[PDB]
Amino acid sequence: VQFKLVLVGDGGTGKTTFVKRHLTGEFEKKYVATLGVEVHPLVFHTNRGPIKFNVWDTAGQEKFGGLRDGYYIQAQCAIIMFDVTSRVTYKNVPNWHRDLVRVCENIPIVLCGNKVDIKDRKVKAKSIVFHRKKNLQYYDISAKSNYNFEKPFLWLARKLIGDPNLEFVAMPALAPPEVAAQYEHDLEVAQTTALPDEDDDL
Amino acid sequence: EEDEEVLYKVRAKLFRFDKDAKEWKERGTGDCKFLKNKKTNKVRILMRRDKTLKICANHIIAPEYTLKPNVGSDRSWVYACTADIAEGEAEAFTFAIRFGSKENADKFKEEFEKAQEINKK
Amino acid sequence: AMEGILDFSNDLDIALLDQVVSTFYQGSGVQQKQAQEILTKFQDNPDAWQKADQILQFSTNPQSKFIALSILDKLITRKWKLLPNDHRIGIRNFVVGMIISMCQDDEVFKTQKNLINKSDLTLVQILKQEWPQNWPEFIPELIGSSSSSVNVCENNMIVLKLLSEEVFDFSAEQMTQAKALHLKNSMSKEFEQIFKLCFQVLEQGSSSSLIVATLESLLRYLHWIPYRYIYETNILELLSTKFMTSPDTRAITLKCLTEVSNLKIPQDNDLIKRQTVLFFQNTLQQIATSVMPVTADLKATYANANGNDQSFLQDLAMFLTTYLARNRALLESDESLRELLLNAHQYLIQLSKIEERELFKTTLDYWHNLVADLFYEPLKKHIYEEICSQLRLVIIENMVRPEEVLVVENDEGEIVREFVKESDTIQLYKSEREVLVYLTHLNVIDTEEIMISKLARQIDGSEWSWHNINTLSWAIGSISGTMSEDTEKRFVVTVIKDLLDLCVKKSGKDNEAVVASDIMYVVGQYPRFLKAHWNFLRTVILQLFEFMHETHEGVQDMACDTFIKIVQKCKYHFVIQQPRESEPFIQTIIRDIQKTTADLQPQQVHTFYKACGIIISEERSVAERNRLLSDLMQLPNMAWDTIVEQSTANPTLLDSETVKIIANIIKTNVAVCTSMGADFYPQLGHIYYNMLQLYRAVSSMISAQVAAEGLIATKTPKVRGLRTIKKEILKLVETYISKARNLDDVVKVLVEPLLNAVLEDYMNNVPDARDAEVLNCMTTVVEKVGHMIPQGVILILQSVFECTLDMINKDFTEYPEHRVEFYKLLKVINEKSFAAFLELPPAAFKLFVDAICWAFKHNNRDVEVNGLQIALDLVKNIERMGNVPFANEFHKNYFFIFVSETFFVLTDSDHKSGFSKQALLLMKLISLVYDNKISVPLYQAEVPQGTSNQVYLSQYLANMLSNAFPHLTSEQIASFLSALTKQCKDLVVFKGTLRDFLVQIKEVGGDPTDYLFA
Ligand SMILES: *C1=CC(=O)O[C@@H](/C=C/C(=C\[C@H](C)C/C=C/C(C)=C/[C@@H](C)C(=O)[C@@H](C)[C@H](O)[C@@H](C)C/C(C)=C/C(=O)O)CC)[C@H]1C
Ligand SMILES: Nc1nc2c(ncn2[C@@H]2O[C@H](COP(=O)(O)OP(=O)(O)NP(=O)(O)O)[C@@H](O)[C@H]2O)c(=O)[nH]1
Ligand SMILES: [Cl-]
Ligand SMILES: [Cl-]
Ligand SMILES: [Cl-]
Ligand SMILES: [Cl-]
Ligand SMILES: [Cl-]
Ligand SMILES: [Mg+2]
């Protein structure tokens, strides 16, 4: 049970950071532009079984676009990303959508306004209406704070499996096992590397 | 987790040290539970991410482990884990775990050490 | 192995290409990754287009052929006119031929839709270049070919849909103004024949893929076609009846009919009005008979999510809302149209019950539109009275949690404090409140009756639940202001009495938390009531104080917010001595402040103090106010006094507990200063000199720690704590100065010691120990008193300019806070104290210009915007000086630097956010030469004696563009510059010429006459 998901949107909107968060739990502070596309499998456990997304995280920078719409071929769902602190990224949403639906004529698509954690919001909530006529789902999200981060994948899962009452569930937890000079050096380096974002609530 | 008693639960953020890059990377935020197996009396750490409920920590609170402070925090502990199976096959990590307050951090350590004594029996 | 396709010295192994493509699309892991990189390299090879025909002919992998078409698309869009004519003819021929070939084979046409769609788009790219000037018979032959095959006819509809999109919907960013007009005019000129074909197909068929395709094309045409095509044909009848009956055409027809509801159409034409009524009438009849009756449970249907039901219901909402917002008046006067008007609205009522936030927002927008109209337009509200009454219920029952309500039910059924703010429901609540306020005004009796009886069913337990008491309490709170004070008085008394009843009977921490949250919300929403009922107000506040000792952290936190929310509006009643009270209540609050705030977290204590400040500033008698301020600050001042004693005895404060105490003392002062503003001065004066001494002491500790432990010291709890003291001191001074009314005291008492304490410390710390907050503090200092401290401003620049620039000029990312505050400071200095830059040594002034241009190149908006504003302000500053040596030298040294740097960011496709301000700056720069405002030659014998700066500017710019964009012709550059310089007094036109240039630089062979567009 696997589905091809294409992720599209302007450079710097947080596509790769969003995916990485889902993959490993981490939050990547640096902006390393995606080159063409990166494909990652991403599994969720649900009350209807596991669902596997093969996430095609595409490049938003025109100069790094690679195959561009060639990535969309046979996609079964999609996320269109923009950044609520950058109005141009919202203005470009119809362009991304155009290119996407020309290749993928009838797929479920989530529109996501990323970076809502940032105080100075520029794309006003009230302005976000493009999704309505296009039947896209919309969510405010933040890859940084995790605000609504699961929502796009839950909705897509529901649409793809065709079960509106589908929910994420806890993986059963197998009992863990009962298992040196370099350990000392490794731990020392760890202890003396500051933890990030020490001003956060957790 | 039906065969297990919840000895302790606390909200936490878990990191793993990437040694290649010299940085801490978040692995999950959510409830960190200490779980005692009712059949075997072994105590493990089991932690799950909020919302996705994916396991980000699953390992025995081995008696050999030692909680160490991080240089940047008065509300975190770092320790070497030799066998965590959150991702699948048993794997070694240097973990850091941070809490909402110093009080919570100190309570964790106390509970952590009690669980170590249980695991010793 | 796969890399072989990259070797163009050998024939292309097509089979190997298909393997690489298959590996990329169907493979995984490393193999997929390698194939991707190989394909991108193949695709980007500028000769790869020459393989396209071979691929199309010989490949057995549809994705290979797609990729071939992508390669051609890139060639067509960017290099078409660089091709020999034979290659243009050839490419057109095999694209056309492939399309024909694929349409004629039924299996291919059925199973290769993606590839045919891609082929069609590619054809459309050729049309954009070639049609109609070099392809005049494309449309007539398309029309003719349509009759020979159902597959071709259908595909022709796809081609025409894409052409309409590319010309009318997506041309603005992709074509020059002139080319866009050309193509729009061309499509307009032949649309009569296009429509004839469209209408014929729609007439002669019912429900098929050809019909769907035709309707898909119609949707696009409706964006721009003249309304006569819609209204003077039978097409509305077909759309609203026939095509609504079959489900596979229903979706697209409904979308077309929504767009028809937006067509530009005469307002004085009775027959057209009838037609507009008729299609709506037809459409609604089809819904009721073929889909679902008005009584259907759309909430249930949507939730079941069968087939395309969600999409359909979405599209229905869009149709009903769009049509009615424009046209409902057509249905309001004629008695025979009343049932239709009301049935349409009843469908909307049913749609508004669906659980789908975004859909709800769409319907709520419509309700807002309706009720706002009903509020004003005479004799209309009675028509909708039943609809509005149903709407009241829907809104009251679907109220989202207000931002103020800090408790929420967790997954285990426990009422707890929220983890985070629900940021994405802020706008939703405002929209709900807005509509409900209107609805209340429209019928206050109905609204009150609904609320008062719903509340009665909570008390007697018949409908009791957390959801129901919550939504109701939120709704009651939200309509504050809608009733007259007198009416409100009775309403609020009933509500509170009933909430207090609910409080007495529903026990347990969870229940109590829910009820407490709801009472706090309601009372905070009715200050007008509180003001008129002192006994009540006093008792509420005392109860909030009791909650400040709650073990329930959600209730505790909400008590603090509710306290200040009430105080913000009711402060006057706290400052005066009320009848039958022995003291003003502020005195009671202050006297017991230690007890009241004992269990609060520090930041909550600060909010409490801030609230007391609000009250104290109500006292306008200076003596009494200052005494109140003194009384309020008693505890922090006493803590302060004893720390100032211990600290000055010996720097060893090395105590973490002491650092926390100090930080909290300063935070408390910040909090009170925030609400008291100018009135805070006496308190500031009490601590000022010792506070600046403490800043110095703490600075020494930080430096010492870094020396002893290394940069890593800055991450430690101790050092972060010490810096918090510095930051909060800076914040306190910034806060006071930003609000100061006596600027003479600021300058004569505050500024000199401030600068002495902070500037050298900033300059002489290592980069990682410098606080950006210093820069922020100085901005406010310069903003408020800069005009009075010319030497102080110079001191500020000397201490922070060069050292901060060096921190931020190696990349765009390091020290992000310093970066932002740095340019804010430069901005206000350049605005208010330009003379400070005039005093800079030439080397430092060069760095200033460098700093400005560096700011241009940021993508970060906070920096970019200030950079462009500084540049513009600087040019104005210089211009204002007139014909003097400094201005003349500035132009000689920097005019072309600013022109070229502005051009660079305009043209590099990485700074599109700054377009408007870049254009403004460029226009200013050009207008200086155009208006002969530069008094010296901008050139050095380099050019003949008498040569005007106008002639030299063109020559410079032509040369710059020639070298920077060598693919442009000389005439392209010449024509662009002529238009641009001529238009340097008309920003909107000037901007259009810039946009046209940005289009032309992306392709070869741009028409130079395009720059004559007008
Ligand atoms: C249940 C348990 C709990 O611990 O706290 C409760 C929270 C109560 C809150 C506010 C209430 C409304 C404060 C009570 C005020 C009160 C009883 C004031 C009287 C002096 C008063 O004026 C009374 C007699 C009249 O009847 C009031 C109720 C209506 C008026 C003003 C009539 C009139 O003026 O004509 C939390 C903020 C709860 C969680
Ligand atoms: N504050 C904040 N920053 C974010 C968020 N999501 C991503 N970012 C930041 O924004 C930058 C860009 O992130 P990235 O994931 O590389 O964006 P992208 O859309 O993949 N770019 P590209 O299309 O070029 O590959 C990174 O520095 C990242 O840390 C967010 O939710 N909040
Ligand atoms: Cl795009
Ligand atoms: Cl294909
Ligand atoms: Cl006509
Ligand atoms: Cl008042
Ligand atoms: Cl020429
Ligand atoms: Mg990316």
CSV table of N, CA and C in Angstrom, one decimal, chain A residues 26-111:
chain,number,residue,atom,x,y,z
A,26,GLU,N,13.8,15.7,13.2
A,26,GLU,CA,14.7,16.8,13.3
A,26,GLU,C,14.1,18.1,12.7
A,27,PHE,N,14.6,19.2,13.1
A,27,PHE,CA,14.4,20.5,12.4
A,27,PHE,C,15.6,21.1,11.8
A,28,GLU,N,15.7,21.1,10.5
A,28,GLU,CA,16.9,21.6,9.8
A,28,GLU,C,16.8,23.1,9.7
A,29,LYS,N,17.7,23.8,10.4
A,29,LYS,CA,17.7,25.3,10.3
A,29,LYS,C,18.3,25.9,9.1
A,30,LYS,N,19.2,25.1,8.4
A,30,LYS,CA,19.9,25.6,7.2
A,30,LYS,C,19.1,25.4,6.0
A,31,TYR,N,19.3,26.3,5.0
A,31,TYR,CA,18.6,26.3,3.7
A,31,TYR,C,19.6,25.7,2.7
A,32,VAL,N,19.5,24.4,2.5
A,32,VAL,CA,20.3,23.8,1.4
A,32,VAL,C,19.2,23.5,0.3
A,33,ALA,N,19.3,24.2,-0.8
A,33,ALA,CA,18.3,24.1,-1.9
A,33,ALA,C,18.3,22.7,-2.5
A,34,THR,N,17.1,22.1,-2.6
A,34,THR,CA,17.0,20.8,-3.3
A,34,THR,C,17.4,20.9,-4.7
A,35,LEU,N,18.1,19.9,-5.2
A,35,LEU,CA,18.6,19.8,-6.6
A,35,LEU,C,17.7,18.8,-7.4
A,36,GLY,N,16.8,19.4,-8.1
A,36,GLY,CA,15.8,18.6,-8.9
A,36,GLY,C,14.8,18.0,-8.0
A,37,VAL,N,15.0,16.8,-7.5
A,37,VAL,CA,14.1,16.1,-6.6
A,37,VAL,C,14.9,15.1,-5.6
A,38,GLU,N,14.3,15.0,-4.5
A,38,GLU,CA,14.7,13.9,-3.5
A,38,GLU,C,13.5,13.0,-3.2
A,39,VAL,N,13.7,11.7,-3.3
A,39,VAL,CA,12.6,10.8,-3.0
A,39,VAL,C,12.9,10.1,-1.7
A,40,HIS,N,11.8,10.2,-0.8
A,40,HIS,CA,11.9,9.6,0.5
A,40,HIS,C,10.7,8.8,0.8
A,41,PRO,N,10.8,7.5,1.2
A,41,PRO,CA,9.7,6.8,1.7
A,41,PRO,C,9.3,7.3,3.1
A,42,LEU,N,8.0,7.3,3.4
A,42,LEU,CA,7.5,7.9,4.6
A,42,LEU,C,6.2,7.1,5.0
A,43,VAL,N,6.3,6.4,6.1
A,43,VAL,CA,5.2,5.5,6.5
A,43,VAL,C,4.5,6.0,7.7
A,44,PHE,N,3.2,5.9,7.7
A,44,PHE,CA,2.3,6.2,8.9
A,44,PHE,C,1.5,5.0,9.2
A,45,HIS,N,1.3,4.8,10.5
A,45,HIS,CA,0.5,3.7,11.0
A,45,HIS,C,-0.9,4.3,11.3
A,46,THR,N,-1.9,3.6,10.8
A,46,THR,CA,-3.3,4.0,10.9
A,46,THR,C,-4.1,2.9,11.4
A,47,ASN,N,-5.4,3.2,11.8
A,47,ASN,CA,-6.3,2.2,12.2
A,47,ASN,C,-6.8,1.3,11.0
A,48,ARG,N,-6.4,1.7,9.8
A,48,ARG,CA,-6.7,0.9,8.6
A,48,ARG,C,-5.4,0.2,8.1
A,49,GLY,N,-4.4,0.2,8.9
A,49,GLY,CA,-3.1,-0.4,8.5
A,49,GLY,C,-2.1,0.7,8.2
A,50,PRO,N,-0.8,0.2,7.8
A,50,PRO,CA,0.2,1.2,7.4
A,50,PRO,C,-0.1,1.7,6.0
A,51,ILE,N,0.3,3.0,5.9
A,51,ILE,CA,0.2,3.7,4.6
A,51,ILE,C,1.6,4.2,4.3
A,52,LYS,N,2.1,4.0,3.1
A,52,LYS,CA,3.4,4.4,2.7
A,52,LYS,C,3.3,5.5,1.6
A,53,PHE,N,3.8,6.6,1.9
A,53,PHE,CA,4.0,7.7,0.9
A,53,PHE,C,5.4,7.7,0.4
A,54,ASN,N,5.6,7.6,-0.9
A,54,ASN,CA,6.9,7.9,-1.5
A,54,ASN,C,6.9,9.4,-1.9
A,55,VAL,N,7.6,10.1,-1.1
A,55,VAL,CA,7.6,11.6,-1.2
A,55,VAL,C,8.6,12.1,-2.1
A,56,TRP,N,8.1,12.6,-3.2
A,56,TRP,CA,9.0,13.3,-4.2
A,56,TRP,C,9.0,14.8,-3.9
A,57,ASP,N,10.1,15.2,-3.2
A,57,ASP,CA,10.3,16.5,-2.7
A,57,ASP,C,11.1,17.3,-3.8
A,58,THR,N,10.4,18.1,-4.5
A,58,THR,CA,10.9,18.8,-5.7
A,58,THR,C,11.6,20.1,-5.4
A,59,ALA,N,12.4,20.5,-6.3
A,59,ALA,CA,13.1,21.8,-6.2
A,59,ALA,C,12.2,22.9,-6.6
A,60,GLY,N,12.2,24.0,-5.7
A,60,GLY,CA,11.4,25.2,-6.0
A,60,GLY,C,12.1,26.3,-6.7
A,61,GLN,N,13.5,26.3,-6.6
A,61,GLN,CA,14.3,27.3,-7.3
A,61,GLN,C,14.3,26.9,-8.8
A,62,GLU,N,14.0,27.9,-9.6
A,62,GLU,CA,13.9,27.6,-11.1
A,62,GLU,C,15.2,27.1,-11.6
A,63,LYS,N,16.4,27.7,-11.1
A,63,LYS,CA,17.7,27.2,-11.6
A,63,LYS,C,18.0,25.8,-11.2
A,64,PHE,N,17.3,25.3,-10.2
A,64,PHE,CA,17.6,23.9,-9.8
A,64,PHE,C,16.4,22.9,-10.1
A,65,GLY,N,15.5,23.4,-11.0
A,65,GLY,CA,14.2,22.7,-11.2
A,65,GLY,C,14.3,21.3,-11.8
A,66,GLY,N,15.4,20.9,-12.4
A,66,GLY,CA,15.6,19.6,-13.0
A,66,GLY,C,14.5,19.3,-14.0
A,67,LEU,N,13.9,18.1,-13.8
A,67,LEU,CA,12.9,17.7,-14.8
A,67,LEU,C,11.5,18.4,-14.7
A,68,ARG,N,11.4,19.3,-13.7
A,68,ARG,CA,10.2,20.1,-13.5
A,68,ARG,C,9.0,19.2,-13.4
A,69,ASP,N,8.0,19.5,-14.4
A,69,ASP,CA,6.8,18.7,-14.4
A,69,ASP,C,6.9,17.2,-14.7
A,70,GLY,N,8.1,16.8,-15.2
A,70,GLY,CA,8.4,15.4,-15.3
A,70,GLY,C,8.3,14.6,-14.0
A,71,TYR,N,8.5,15.3,-12.9
A,71,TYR,CA,8.4,14.7,-11.6
A,71,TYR,C,7.0,14.3,-11.2
A,72,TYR,N,6.0,14.9,-11.8
A,72,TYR,CA,4.6,14.8,-11.4
A,72,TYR,C,4.0,13.6,-12.1
A,73,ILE,N,4.6,13.0,-13.1
A,73,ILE,CA,4.1,11.9,-13.8
A,73,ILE,C,3.7,10.8,-12.8
A,74,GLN,N,2.4,10.4,-12.9
A,74,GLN,CA,1.8,9.3,-12.1
A,74,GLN,C,1.8,9.6,-10.5
A,75,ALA,N,1.9,10.8,-10.1
A,75,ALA,CA,1.7,11.2,-8.7
A,75,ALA,C,0.3,10.8,-8.4
A,76,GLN,N,0.1,10.4,-7.2
A,76,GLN,CA,-1.3,10.0,-6.7
A,76,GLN,C,-1.9,11.0,-5.7
A,77,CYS,N,-1.0,12.0,-5.3
A,77,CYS,CA,-1.4,13.0,-4.4
A,77,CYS,C,-0.3,14.1,-4.4
A,78,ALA,N,-0.6,15.2,-3.7
A,78,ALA,CA,0.3,16.3,-3.7
A,78,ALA,C,0.1,17.3,-2.6
A,79,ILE,N,1.2,17.9,-2.2
A,79,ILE,CA,1.2,19.1,-1.4
A,79,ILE,C,1.8,20.3,-2.1
A,80,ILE,N,1.1,21.4,-2.1
A,80,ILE,CA,1.6,22.7,-2.6
A,80,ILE,C,1.9,23.5,-1.4
A,81,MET,N,3.1,24.0,-1.3
A,81,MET,CA,3.7,24.7,-0.2
A,81,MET,C,3.9,26.2,-0.5
A,82,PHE,N,3.5,27.1,0.4
A,82,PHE,CA,4.0,28.5,0.4
A,82,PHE,C,4.4,28.9,1.8
A,83,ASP,N,4.8,30.1,1.9
A,83,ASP,CA,5.3,30.7,3.2
A,83,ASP,C,4.5,31.9,3.5
A,84,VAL,N,3.9,31.9,4.7
A,84,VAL,CA,3.0,33.0,5.1
A,84,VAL,C,3.7,34.3,5.4
A,85,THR,N,5.0,34.3,5.4
A,85,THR,CA,5.9,35.5,5.6
A,85,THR,C,6.4,36.0,4.3
A,86,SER,N,6.1,35.3,3.2
A,86,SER,CA,6.5,35.7,1.8
A,86,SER,C,5.4,35.7,0.8
A,87,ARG,N,4.8,36.9,0.5
A,87,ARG,CA,3.6,37.0,-0.3
A,87,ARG,C,3.8,36.5,-1.7
A,88,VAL,N,5.0,36.7,-2.3
A,88,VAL,CA,5.3,36.2,-3.6
A,88,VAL,C,5.1,34.7,-3.7
A,89,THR,N,5.4,34.0,-2.6
A,89,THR,CA,5.2,32.5,-2.6
A,89,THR,C,3.7,32.1,-2.7
A,90,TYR,N,2.9,32.9,-2.1
A,90,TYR,CA,1.4,32.7,-2.3
A,90,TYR,C,1.0,33.0,-3.7
A,91,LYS,N,1.5,34.2,-4.2
A,91,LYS,CA,1.1,34.6,-5.6
A,91,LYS,C,1.5,33.5,-6.6
A,92,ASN,N,2.6,32.8,-6.3
A,92,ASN,CA,3.0,31.7,-7.3
A,92,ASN,C,2.3,30.4,-7.1
A,93,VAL,N,1.4,30.3,-6.1
A,93,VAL,CA,0.6,29.1,-5.9
A,93,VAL,C,-0.2,28.6,-7.1
A,94,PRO,N,-0.9,29.6,-7.8
A,94,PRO,CA,-1.6,29.1,-9.0
A,94,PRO,C,-0.7,28.6,-10.1
A,95,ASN,N,0.5,29.1,-10.2
A,95,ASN,CA,1.5,28.6,-11.2
A,95,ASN,C,1.9,27.2,-10.9
A,96,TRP,N,2.2,26.9,-9.7
A,96,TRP,CA,2.5,25.5,-9.3
A,96,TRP,C,1.4,24.6,-9.5
A,97,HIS,N,0.2,25.0,-9.1
A,97,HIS,CA,-1.0,24.2,-9.3
A,97,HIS,C,-1.3,23.9,-10.7
A,98,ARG,N,-1.2,24.9,-11.6
A,98,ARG,CA,-1.4,24.8,-13.0
A,98,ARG,C,-0.5,23.7,-13.5
A,99,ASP,N,0.8,23.8,-13.3
A,99,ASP,CA,1.8,22.8,-13.8
A,99,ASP,C,1.5,21.4,-13.3
A,100,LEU,N,1.1,21.4,-12.0
A,100,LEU,CA,0.8,20.1,-11.4
A,100,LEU,C,-0.5,19.4,-12.0
A,101,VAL,N,-1.6,20.1,-12.0
A,101,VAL,CA,-2.8,19.5,-12.5
A,101,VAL,C,-2.9,19.2,-14.0
A,102,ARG,N,-2.0,19.9,-14.8
A,102,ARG,CA,-1.9,19.6,-16.2
A,102,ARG,C,-1.3,18.1,-16.4
A,103,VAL,N,-0.5,17.7,-15.4
A,103,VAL,CA,0.1,16.3,-15.5
A,103,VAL,C,-0.8,15.4,-14.6
A,104,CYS,N,-1.3,15.9,-13.5
A,104,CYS,CA,-2.1,15.0,-12.5
A,104,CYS,C,-3.5,15.5,-12.4
A,105,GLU,N,-4.4,15.0,-13.3
A,105,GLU,CA,-5.7,15.6,-13.5
A,105,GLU,C,-6.7,15.4,-12.4
A,106,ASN,N,-6.6,14.3,-11.7
A,106,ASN,CA,-7.5,14.1,-10.6
A,106,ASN,C,-6.9,13.5,-9.4
A,107,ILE,N,-6.2,14.2,-8.6
A,107,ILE,CA,-5.6,13.8,-7.4
A,107,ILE,C,-5.9,14.7,-6.2
A,108,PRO,N,-6.0,14.1,-5.0
A,108,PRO,CA,-6.1,14.9,-3.8
A,108,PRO,C,-4.9,15.8,-3.6
A,109,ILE,N,-5.1,17.0,-3.3
A,109,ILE,CA,-4.0,18.0,-3.1
A,109,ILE,C,-4.3,18.9,-1.8
A,110,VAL,N,-3.2,19.0,-1.0
A,110,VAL,CA,-3.2,19.9,0.2
A,110,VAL,C,-2.4,21.1,-0.2
A,111,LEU,N,-3.0,22.3,0.1
A,111,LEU,CA,-2.3,23.5,0.1
A,111,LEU,C,-1.8,23.9,1.5
